[PDB]
Design a protein around this ligand. Sequence first.
Ligand code: ADP
Ligand code: ADP
Ligand code: VO4
Ligand code: VO4
Ligand code: MG
Ligand code: MG
Lengths: 580, 580
Amino acid sequence: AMADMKILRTLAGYLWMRDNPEFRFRVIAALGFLVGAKVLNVQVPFLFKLAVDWLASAFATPAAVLIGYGIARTGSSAFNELRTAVFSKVALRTIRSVSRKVFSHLHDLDLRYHLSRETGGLNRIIDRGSRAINFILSAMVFNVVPTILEISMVSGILAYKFGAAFAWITSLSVGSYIVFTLAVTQWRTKFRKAMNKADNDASTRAIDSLINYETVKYFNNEGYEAEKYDQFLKKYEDAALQTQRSLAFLNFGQSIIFSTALSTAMVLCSQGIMNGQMTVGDLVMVNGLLFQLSLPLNFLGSVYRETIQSLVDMKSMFQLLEEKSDITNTSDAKPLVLKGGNIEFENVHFSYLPERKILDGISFVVPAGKSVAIVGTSGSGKSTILRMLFRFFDTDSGNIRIDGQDIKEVRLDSLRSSIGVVPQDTVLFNDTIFHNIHYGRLSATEEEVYEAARRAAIHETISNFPDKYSTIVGERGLKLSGGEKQRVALARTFLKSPAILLCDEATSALDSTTEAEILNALKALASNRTSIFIAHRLTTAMQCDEIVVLENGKVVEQGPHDELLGKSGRYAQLWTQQNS
Amino acid sequence: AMADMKILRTLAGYLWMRDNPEFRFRVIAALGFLVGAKVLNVQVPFLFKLAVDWLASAFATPAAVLIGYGIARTGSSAFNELRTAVFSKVALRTIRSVSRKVFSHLHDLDLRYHLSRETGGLNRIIDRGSRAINFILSAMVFNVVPTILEISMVSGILAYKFGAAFAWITSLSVGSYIVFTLAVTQWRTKFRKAMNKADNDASTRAIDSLINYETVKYFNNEGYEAEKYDQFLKKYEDAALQTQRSLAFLNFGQSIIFSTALSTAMVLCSQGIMNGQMTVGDLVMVNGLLFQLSLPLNFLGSVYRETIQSLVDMKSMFQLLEEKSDITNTSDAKPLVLKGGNIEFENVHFSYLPERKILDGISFVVPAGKSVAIVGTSGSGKSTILRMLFRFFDTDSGNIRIDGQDIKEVRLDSLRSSIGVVPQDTVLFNDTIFHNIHYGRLSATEEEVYEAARRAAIHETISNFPDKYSTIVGERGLKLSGGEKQRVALARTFLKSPAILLCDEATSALDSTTEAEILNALKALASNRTSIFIAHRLTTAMQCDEIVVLENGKVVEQGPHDELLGKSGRYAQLWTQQNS
Ligand SMILES: Nc1ncnc2c1ncn2[C@@H]1O[C@H](COP(=O)(O)OP(=O)(O)O)[C@@H](O)[C@H]1O
Ligand SMILES: Nc1ncnc2c1ncn2[C@@H]1O[C@H](COP(=O)(O)OP(=O)(O)O)[C@@H](O)[C@H]1O
Ligand code: VO4
Ligand code: VO4
Ligand SMILES: [Mg+2]
Ligand SMILES: [Mg+2]
């Protein structure tokens, strides 16, 4: 309950944004436009009644009255239609601002929220909530107050010409109506939540199946996905069908309470034909007044039903907005200043889950201007150090140091800009290859981009393409070949030119002859700055000065290439079979 | 225009599905429920008027009349609410069937449509269209005919008591109203299409940015995505703002034509106070009758506006449904029968685009029970043959033969089941690893799955996991390591056990010591059936009997390992530097 109150308060603050004085003029103009129509709408029946009465008692004068009636009809519609134009602008501006803020916060969220997300549920929630905000903004300003005022006016009219029992009857009817409506809305709130949960799951299942299109084409199991989607759609079918019947119960209950209220009103007055109310003029008055109470009352019931209905969909975003990143910067942060690349590890211990410990007692030092290569079993978690060094996941009980400085103390913005890393799996934007290669540094010019491709051994291949530097790379970089996709990612790091180089499985999908050229380029440019290369191939680690072997989360042997081969350790066995 | 007529005809056929006799009973019940309410609704004012007139001329009899008035009010609402329950069921069933058919056709579509799709536009279109069908189904059955009948009845009532000019005035007003409404709807149709196009682009851009989360976290360029999303949202803002004002023009035009029609009606009758219509009773009659014409007429205008509005969103799916796969099976197809794996190529020529030719004059033979390995430059397009052999893309001017049979003539279903391929890039479902490894063959039992993992060198690693055979693999298999993800894909092919094995970059992210065990398992199981291994590493091709070198789309050297080394060709140079 109090969570919804915070949601309404936050939305209300957006409407009354103090920064823009134009919005203040815009909102008050629409309100005055509504009250002007409401006053004129009341005046219209009075003008018509006066003309009819005057004509009955009795030409230019009726014509002017009929002309004035013409503008009155035009004026009532003119005020209403001209009112919604302004509020539409302010509501749409609020929609855009809220969507942009949600987008920014979603990208601000931590990595642990990702890698386990429901792809599709996020966009479905965003669309559903963005559709919901417009109605809540539109209805709240113009509908709640005038209807209550009209209800109060009609209540005062009915209080006039006291019947000494009609007030009690209508109070009881109103109380019963409110109780019934609140109970029905509270019951129906549960059904919408069940339907919403099923809809997101089907969408994310469909999107996952679409992502697995290559696998479901390689394997003949195509009907299984259709069957699962049919089951999810059947669940959504049942959830939606339950809601529709519940709506019919509310509508039937809506009429039955008013129908018996009208019946008991006519019965009560007919019971007093003699020794009581004897004027038949009052008989039509009570019927007309009750209808005049019914129409605004029915409008109020729809407004609350739609508001509580639309507010349920709103809880989906704002729960996501309350999510906070686990990793946060220190209250006092020092900018990262380094004159050389030195990395030190002091008994780092880290675990993805409390049950299993991946890293245990790993300690190594990276001298400035030197390259260190780590090799080992694929299950040893060698790449976890590279991910942890980038501070994707914070350390538990270990000390990590760069140039004699605390990485945790150092600001994240400064930390994530001095070093550059080549991803193990290359992902490319669905945009031009020129944009993909220029994403490394937007300040770079065309000459810098072209020379970077030459050292990546890709400019010659690009020159032979039908569209030089303009081919459209497909979704997730599927259109380009594996090797060329690998070369593109390396070119981004080359253009970025970071202080510390961290390549992860660089020469995996690359032929032998091109790898020799790439390694020579690395050993010339990266002489003055430290780098760390990780790869199972023995040829890339041979050139490195220092080689260590990591297995089962603990370092085994350290030293240069010559010492490792002589020691006849784990490294020697790996190189022996590779040479063959 | 005629395209929309086909769309309406297809939707109408779903409602009258001949297979289910229950639907026929369901639709006719609702129609009879509506006409019963309509007849009773007309009777209600007559009953009230009779009671008032009888009471004025003049108790148990009025009480029974008021009681009967009570059921009349209850009966009118009971028929209407009980009507919508059945049609909701049939409409939702139609929705589910249409969504399932669209899902199936989308997965039926060809590969060329994929790999260049707009991820997100598809789901947004599906959601928008699925929301649109319900209103069109609901409104068409119950709204078009009764409103026209009521309009005709009121037109006949106005034709009664001829004024000799009111019929002409109302005919002119109706014609002008229809012309104005059609013109406004035709003009507004363009605005909706512009808004719809912008919405899909923003969604697909956001989803692409979410997919590129790792890259936008590795590189500090985070604000660029927000700026692009803001620009797209601003375009959608402008497109939506243009629509809202156009709606206000229609509504203002709605009232002004009726307001002047009422004004000229009152002016015309007031002009004939003398020497004409002198009874003031007719003055209120024309006013009441005009309002009785106005309410159904306004309802008709809203129905057409909503129908033409919702039909624009419908064109999005049905254009996609008309899409047909480029590759189709032959009219007469023979089941694939083979006693051995023989593959023959006869001057195959294939090109992704007409500008560049990738494959030119490639001819090779794969003997039964033998393994052939191809190596070369990454840009030589060696993997295109494997993709083409699976008939993802049809050949242009080449002959491809399996066991002396035409692959094109052989049915696609039979062709895509005899052979199995390991993808170059491994994609895993967002489900349990047990389900991922069991996807190879649903008929396999638990024992077959467990023994398959042992030969994949992954059971030992899985046993040490916190959740044995129950860990949840993340989206696109990001949670698991590269090596373990590679091993999982191999286990699927092992469980499938196809007649022809085709591995693409199998031992890429795998340490040396595990690769020796895997290769030994391959050489024992795959002795009786042919296989093709492609990889840049020289150790995997050494064991193969026949080695060929493919560069620049043409074969260079062929023969066993010993002959290739002696020839001092391209293969010798590649192996020389690898040995070092
Ligand atoms: N997202 C994850 N969730 C659970 N366990 C993980 C995850 N990533 C890695 N591991 C564990 O870490 C080990 C591999 O570590 P990783 O850093 O992936 O090494 P590499 O990348 O060199 O294969 C595996 O045994 C696996 O169980
Ligand atoms: N989807 C594609 N669109 C355009 N060109 C492509 C596509 N896939 C491959 N190519 C071209 O084919 C060559 C690589 O072929 P490919 O079969 O990817 O070989 P490999 O997989 O061994 O790298 C590249 O030079 C590239 O230009
Ligand atoms: O040249 V490949 O992308 O098939 O390793
Ligand atoms: O063991 V790895 O997945 O970093 O090649
Ligand atoms: Mg490859
Ligand atoms: Mg790896």
